[PDB]
Short mmCIF file of C-alpha atoms in Angstrom, two decimals:
data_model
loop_
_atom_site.label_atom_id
_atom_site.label_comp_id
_atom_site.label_asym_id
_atom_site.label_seq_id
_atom_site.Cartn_x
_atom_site.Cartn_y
_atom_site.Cartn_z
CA UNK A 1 76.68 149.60 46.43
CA UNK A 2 78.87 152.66 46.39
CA UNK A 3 77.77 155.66 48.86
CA UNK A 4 76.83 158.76 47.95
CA UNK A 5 80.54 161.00 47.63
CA UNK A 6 79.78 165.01 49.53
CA UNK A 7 78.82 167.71 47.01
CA UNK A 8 82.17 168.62 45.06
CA UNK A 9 82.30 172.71 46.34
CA UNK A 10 83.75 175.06 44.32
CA UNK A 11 85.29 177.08 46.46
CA UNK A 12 87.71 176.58 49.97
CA UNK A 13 87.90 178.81 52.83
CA UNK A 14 90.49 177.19 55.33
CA UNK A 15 92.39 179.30 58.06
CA UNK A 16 96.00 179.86 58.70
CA UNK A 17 96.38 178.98 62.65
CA UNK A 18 100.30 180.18 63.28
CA UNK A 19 100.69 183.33 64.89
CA UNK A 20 104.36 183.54 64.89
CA UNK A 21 106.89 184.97 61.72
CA UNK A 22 108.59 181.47 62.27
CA UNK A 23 105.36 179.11 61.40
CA UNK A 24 105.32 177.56 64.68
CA UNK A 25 103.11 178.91 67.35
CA UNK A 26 99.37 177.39 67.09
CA UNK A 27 96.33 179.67 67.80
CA UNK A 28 93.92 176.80 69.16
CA UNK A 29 90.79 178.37 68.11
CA UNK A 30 91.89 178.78 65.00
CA UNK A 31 93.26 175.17 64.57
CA UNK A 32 90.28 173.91 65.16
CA UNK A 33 87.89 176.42 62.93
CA UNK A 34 90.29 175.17 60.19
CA UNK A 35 89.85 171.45 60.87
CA UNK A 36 85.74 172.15 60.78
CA UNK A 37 86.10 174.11 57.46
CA UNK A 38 88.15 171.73 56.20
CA UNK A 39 86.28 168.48 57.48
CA UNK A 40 84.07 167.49 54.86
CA UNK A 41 87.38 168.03 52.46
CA UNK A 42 89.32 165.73 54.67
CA UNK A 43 86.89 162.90 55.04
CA UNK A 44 86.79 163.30 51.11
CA UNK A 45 90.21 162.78 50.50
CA UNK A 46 90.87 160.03 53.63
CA UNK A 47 88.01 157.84 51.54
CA UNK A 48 89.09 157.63 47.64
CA UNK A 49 92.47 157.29 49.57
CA UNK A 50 90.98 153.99 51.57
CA UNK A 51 88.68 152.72 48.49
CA UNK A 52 91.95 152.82 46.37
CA UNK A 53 94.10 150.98 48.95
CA UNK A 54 90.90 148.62 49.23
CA UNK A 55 91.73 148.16 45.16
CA UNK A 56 95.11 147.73 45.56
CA UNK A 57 94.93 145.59 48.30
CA UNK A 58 93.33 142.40 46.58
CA UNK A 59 92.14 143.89 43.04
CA UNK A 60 88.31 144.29 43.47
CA UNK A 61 87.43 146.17 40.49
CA UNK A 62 84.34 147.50 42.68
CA UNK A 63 86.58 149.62 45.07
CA UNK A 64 88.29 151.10 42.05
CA UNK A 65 84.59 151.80 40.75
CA UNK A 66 83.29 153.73 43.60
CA UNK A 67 86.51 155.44 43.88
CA UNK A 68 86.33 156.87 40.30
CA UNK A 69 82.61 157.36 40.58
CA UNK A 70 83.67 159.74 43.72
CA UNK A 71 86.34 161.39 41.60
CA UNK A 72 83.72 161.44 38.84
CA UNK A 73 81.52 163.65 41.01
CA UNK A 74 83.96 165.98 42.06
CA UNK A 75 85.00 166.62 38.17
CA UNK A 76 81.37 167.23 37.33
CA UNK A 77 80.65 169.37 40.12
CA UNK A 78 84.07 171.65 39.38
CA UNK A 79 85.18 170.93 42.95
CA UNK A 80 87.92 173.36 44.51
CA UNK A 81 87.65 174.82 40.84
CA UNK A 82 85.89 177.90 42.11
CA UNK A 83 87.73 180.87 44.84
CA UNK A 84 90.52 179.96 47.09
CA UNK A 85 89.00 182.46 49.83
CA UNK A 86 91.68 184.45 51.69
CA UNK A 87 91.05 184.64 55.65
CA UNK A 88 94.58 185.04 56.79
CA UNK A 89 97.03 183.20 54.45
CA UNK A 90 97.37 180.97 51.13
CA UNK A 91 95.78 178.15 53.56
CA UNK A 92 92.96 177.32 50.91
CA UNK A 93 95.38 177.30 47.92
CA UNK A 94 97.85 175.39 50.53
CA UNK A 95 94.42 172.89 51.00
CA UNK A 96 94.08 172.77 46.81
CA UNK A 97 97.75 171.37 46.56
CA UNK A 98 96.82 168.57 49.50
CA UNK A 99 93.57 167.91 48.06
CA UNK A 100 94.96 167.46 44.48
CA UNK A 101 97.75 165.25 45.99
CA UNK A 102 95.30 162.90 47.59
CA UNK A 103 92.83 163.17 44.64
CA UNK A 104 95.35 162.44 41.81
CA UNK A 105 97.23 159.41 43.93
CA UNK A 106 93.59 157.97 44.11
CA UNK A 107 93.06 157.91 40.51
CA UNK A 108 96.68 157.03 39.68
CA UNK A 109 95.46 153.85 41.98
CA UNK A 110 92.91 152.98 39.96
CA UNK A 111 93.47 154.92 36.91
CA UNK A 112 93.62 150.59 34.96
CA UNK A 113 90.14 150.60 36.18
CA UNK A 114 88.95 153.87 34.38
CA UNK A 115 87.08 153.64 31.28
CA UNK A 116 87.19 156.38 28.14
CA UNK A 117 83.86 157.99 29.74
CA UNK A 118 85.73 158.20 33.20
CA UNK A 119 89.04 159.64 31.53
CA UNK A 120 87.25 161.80 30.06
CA UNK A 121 85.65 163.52 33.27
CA UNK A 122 88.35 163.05 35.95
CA UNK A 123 91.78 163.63 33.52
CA UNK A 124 90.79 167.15 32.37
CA UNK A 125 89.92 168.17 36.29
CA UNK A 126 92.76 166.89 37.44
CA UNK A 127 94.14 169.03 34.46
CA UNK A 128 92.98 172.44 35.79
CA UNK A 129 93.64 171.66 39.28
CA UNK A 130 97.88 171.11 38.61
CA UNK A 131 97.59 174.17 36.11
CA UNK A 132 96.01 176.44 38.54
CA UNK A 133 98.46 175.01 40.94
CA UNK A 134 101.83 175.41 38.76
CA UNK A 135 100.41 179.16 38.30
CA UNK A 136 100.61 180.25 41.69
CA UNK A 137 104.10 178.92 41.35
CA UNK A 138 105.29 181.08 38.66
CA UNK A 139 105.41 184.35 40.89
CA UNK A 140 108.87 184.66 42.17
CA UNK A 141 107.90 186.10 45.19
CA UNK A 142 106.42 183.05 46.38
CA UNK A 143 108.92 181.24 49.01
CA UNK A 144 109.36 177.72 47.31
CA UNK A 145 109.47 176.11 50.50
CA UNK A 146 108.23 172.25 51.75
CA UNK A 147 104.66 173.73 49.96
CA UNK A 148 106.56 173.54 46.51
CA UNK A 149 107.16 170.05 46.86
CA UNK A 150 103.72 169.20 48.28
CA UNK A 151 102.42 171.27 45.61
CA UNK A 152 104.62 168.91 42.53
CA UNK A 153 103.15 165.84 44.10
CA UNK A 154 99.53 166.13 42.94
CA UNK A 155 101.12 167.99 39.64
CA UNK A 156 103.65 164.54 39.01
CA UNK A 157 100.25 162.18 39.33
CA UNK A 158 98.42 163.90 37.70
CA UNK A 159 100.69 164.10 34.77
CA UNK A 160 101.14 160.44 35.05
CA UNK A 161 97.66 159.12 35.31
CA UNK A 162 96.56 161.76 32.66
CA UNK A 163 99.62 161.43 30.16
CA UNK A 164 100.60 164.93 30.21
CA UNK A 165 104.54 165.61 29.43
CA UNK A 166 104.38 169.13 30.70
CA UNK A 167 102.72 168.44 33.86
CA UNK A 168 105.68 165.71 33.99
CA UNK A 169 107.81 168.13 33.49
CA UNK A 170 106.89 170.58 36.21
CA UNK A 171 106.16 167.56 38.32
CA UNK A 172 109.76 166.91 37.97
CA UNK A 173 111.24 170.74 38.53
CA UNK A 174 109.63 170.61 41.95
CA UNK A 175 111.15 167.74 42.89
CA UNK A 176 114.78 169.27 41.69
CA UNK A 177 114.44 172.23 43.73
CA UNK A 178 113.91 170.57 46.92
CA UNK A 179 117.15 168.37 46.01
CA UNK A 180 118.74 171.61 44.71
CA UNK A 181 117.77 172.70 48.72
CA UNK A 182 119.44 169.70 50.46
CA UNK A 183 123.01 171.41 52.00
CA UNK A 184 125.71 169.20 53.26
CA UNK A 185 124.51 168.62 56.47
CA UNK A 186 121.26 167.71 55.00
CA UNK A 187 119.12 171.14 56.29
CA UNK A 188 116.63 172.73 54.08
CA UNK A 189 117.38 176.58 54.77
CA UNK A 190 113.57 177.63 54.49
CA UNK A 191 112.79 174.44 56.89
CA UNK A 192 115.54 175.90 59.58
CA UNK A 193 113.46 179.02 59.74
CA UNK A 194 110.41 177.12 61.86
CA UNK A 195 111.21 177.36 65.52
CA UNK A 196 110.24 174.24 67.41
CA UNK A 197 109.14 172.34 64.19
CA UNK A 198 112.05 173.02 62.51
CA UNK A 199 112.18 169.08 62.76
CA UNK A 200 108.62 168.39 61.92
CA UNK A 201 108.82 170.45 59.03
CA UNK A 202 112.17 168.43 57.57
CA UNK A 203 109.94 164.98 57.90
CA UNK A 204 106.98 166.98 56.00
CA UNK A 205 109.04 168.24 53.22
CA UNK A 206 111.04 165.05 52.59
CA UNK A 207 107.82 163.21 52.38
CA UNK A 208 106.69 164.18 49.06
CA UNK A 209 110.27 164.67 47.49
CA UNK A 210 110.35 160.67 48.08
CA UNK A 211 106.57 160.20 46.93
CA UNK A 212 107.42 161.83 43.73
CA UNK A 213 110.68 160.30 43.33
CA UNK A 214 108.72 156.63 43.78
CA UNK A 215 106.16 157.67 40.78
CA UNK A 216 109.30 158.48 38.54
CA UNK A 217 110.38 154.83 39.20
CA UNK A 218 107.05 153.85 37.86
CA UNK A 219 108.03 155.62 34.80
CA UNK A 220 111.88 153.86 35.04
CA UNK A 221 113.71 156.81 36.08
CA UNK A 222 115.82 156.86 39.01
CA UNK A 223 115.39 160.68 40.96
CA UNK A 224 117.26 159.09 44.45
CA UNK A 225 120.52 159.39 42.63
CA UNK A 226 120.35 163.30 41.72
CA UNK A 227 122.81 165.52 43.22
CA UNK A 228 124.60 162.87 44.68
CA UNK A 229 122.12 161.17 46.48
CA UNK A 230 121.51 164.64 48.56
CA UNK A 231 118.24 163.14 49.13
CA UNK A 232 120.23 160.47 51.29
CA UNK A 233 121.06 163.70 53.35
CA UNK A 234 117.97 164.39 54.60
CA UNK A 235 116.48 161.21 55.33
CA UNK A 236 119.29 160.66 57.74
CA UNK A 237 119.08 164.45 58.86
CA UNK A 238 115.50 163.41 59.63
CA UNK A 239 115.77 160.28 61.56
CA UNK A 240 118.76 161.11 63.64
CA UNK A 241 116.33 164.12 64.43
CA UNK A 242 113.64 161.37 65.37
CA UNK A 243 115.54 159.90 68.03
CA UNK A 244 118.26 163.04 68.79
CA UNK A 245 116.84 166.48 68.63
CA UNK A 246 120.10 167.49 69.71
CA UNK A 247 121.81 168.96 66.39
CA UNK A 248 117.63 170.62 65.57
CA UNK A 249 118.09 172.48 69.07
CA UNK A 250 121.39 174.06 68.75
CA UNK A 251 121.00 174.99 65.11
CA UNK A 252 117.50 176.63 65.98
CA UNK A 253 118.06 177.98 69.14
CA UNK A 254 114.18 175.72 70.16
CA UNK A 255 113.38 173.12 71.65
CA UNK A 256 112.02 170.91 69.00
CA UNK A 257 108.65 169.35 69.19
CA UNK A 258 109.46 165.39 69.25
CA UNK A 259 109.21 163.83 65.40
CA UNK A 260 108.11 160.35 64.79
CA UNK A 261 109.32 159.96 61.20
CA UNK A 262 106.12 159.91 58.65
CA UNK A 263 105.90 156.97 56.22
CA UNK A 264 108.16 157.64 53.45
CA UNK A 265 110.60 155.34 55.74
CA UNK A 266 108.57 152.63 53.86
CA UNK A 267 109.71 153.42 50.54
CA UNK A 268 113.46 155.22 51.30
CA UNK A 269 113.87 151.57 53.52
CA UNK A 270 114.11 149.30 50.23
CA UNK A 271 115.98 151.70 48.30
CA UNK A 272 119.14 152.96 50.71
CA UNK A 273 118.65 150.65 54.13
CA UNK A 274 121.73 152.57 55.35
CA UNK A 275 122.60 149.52 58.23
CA UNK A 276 118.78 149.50 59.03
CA UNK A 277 118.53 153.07 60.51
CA UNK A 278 114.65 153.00 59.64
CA UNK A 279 113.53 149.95 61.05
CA UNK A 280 112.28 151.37 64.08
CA UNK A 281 109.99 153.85 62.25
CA UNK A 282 108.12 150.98 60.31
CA UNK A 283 107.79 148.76 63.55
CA UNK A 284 104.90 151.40 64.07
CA UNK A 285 103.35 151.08 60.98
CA UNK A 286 100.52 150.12 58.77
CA UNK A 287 101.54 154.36 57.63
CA UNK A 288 98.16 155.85 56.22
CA UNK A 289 98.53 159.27 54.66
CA UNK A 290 96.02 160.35 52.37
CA UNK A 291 98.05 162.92 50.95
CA UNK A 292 100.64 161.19 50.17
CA UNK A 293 98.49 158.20 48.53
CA UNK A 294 96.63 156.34 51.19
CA UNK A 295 98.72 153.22 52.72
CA UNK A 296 102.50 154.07 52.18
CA UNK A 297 103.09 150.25 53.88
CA UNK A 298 101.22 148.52 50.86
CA UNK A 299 101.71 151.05 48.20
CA UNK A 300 105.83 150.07 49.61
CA UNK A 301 105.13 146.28 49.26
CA UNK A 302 103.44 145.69 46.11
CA UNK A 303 103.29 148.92 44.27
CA UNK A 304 101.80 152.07 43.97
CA UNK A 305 99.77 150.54 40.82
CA UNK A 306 98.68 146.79 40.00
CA UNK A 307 99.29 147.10 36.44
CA UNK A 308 102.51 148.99 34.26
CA UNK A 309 101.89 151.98 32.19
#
């Protein structure tokens, strides 16, 4: 039988934890009142992630069930439809763009499982929940930093499980400007800006500029190529980084926090091996991300979907 999914809530309230200009610096106490806020979120978003790898793993149409009954719950109950309270920061409109991502790469996952009645309750939430996010998005005072791309992620999926061209679209501009950010040396200038995680944050914003740039192969598009293959720029930036912090250092001024590369390695390894250089990151595998769509290792292997289209 399927257990019961958490009341959907309305509302977030998570707290920013940083306490220096450069994003870096952890408050403790305030790490860990944003984990307990944010708990019953995360276990949310960690199981449609697992019941849709369970479904793409060997193609019970049960997992896909309880998964879309779970998503099914949330849409009825307007989850995260409600306010995005403000304690310090944008960290509950920051925990809307996660949530979305894992929520929307869930039902992407099973979306061949849905039937009209299920479509019909989970595509127009999904719907709101890109909109609201593309809307924050549209004030040009917002820095369109590694959020931006994190943000397009849920906004891409969502416009491909839900057949929406404009959510496409914007999907597709998010990915650009991260691209558009790549320099020759493969630095994001608003990801230099972080102190000691300067590295870290290079490995998060890559992350979901590869995700969405795997869902536009779905769709027969190759994104890898754009700009030159600037992308190609990063991903080594990132796992030189991973074993030599050397170049993050100097260019920073801090002593990086050691990276362990996070598992986009499993997709960018097919596509550009570049004489291997990821191999050691995916000896540590199975990767398990919710937010970027559950198990990277599988979705890698045999596809983000079971069936085209």
């Amino acid at each position: 039988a399927c257990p019961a999914p958490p009341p959907g809530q309305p509302d977030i309230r998570a707290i920013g934890y940083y306490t220096d200009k450069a994003g870096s610096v952890i408050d403790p106490a305030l790490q860990q009142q944003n984990k307990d806020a944010t708990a019953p979120l995360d276990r949310y978003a960690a199981d449609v992630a697992r019941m849709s790898d369970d479904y793409l793993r060997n193609g019970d149409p049960a997992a896909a069930q309880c998964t879309l009954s779970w998503l099914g719950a949330w849409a009825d109950d307007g989850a995260m439809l409600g306010q995005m309270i403000r304690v310090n920061n944008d960290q509950s409109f920051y925990m809307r763009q996660w949530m979305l991502d894992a929520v929307a790469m869930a039902y992407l996952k099973v979306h061949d499982q849905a039937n009209p009645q299920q479509r019909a309750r989970i595509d127009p939430w999904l719907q709101k929940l890109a909109r609201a996010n593309l809307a924050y998005w549209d004030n040009p005072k917002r820095r369109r930093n590694n959020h931006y791309y994190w943000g397009g992620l849920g906004v891409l999926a969502t416009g491909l499980a839900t057949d929406d061209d404009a959510l496409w679209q914007a999907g597709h501009a998010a990915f650009q400007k991260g691209i558009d950010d790549i320099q020759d040396d493969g630095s994001l200038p608003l990801e230099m800006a972080r102190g000691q995680r300067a590295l870290h944050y290079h490995d998060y914003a890559l992350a979901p500029l590869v995700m969405m740039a795997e869902l536009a192969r779905l769709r027969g598009q190759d994104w890898y190529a754009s700009r030159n293959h600037a992308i190609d720029r990063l991903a080594r930036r990132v796992i030189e980084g991973s074993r030599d912090p050397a170049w993050f250092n100097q260019h920073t001024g801090a002593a990086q926090l050691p990276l362990q590369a996070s598992g986009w390695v499993e997709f960018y390894r097919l596509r550009s091996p570049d004489g291997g250089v990821f191999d050691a990151a995916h000896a540590r595998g199975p990767f398990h991300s919710p937010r970027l769509g559950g198990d990277l290792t599988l979705m890698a292997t045999h596809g983000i979907v079971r069936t085209p289209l």
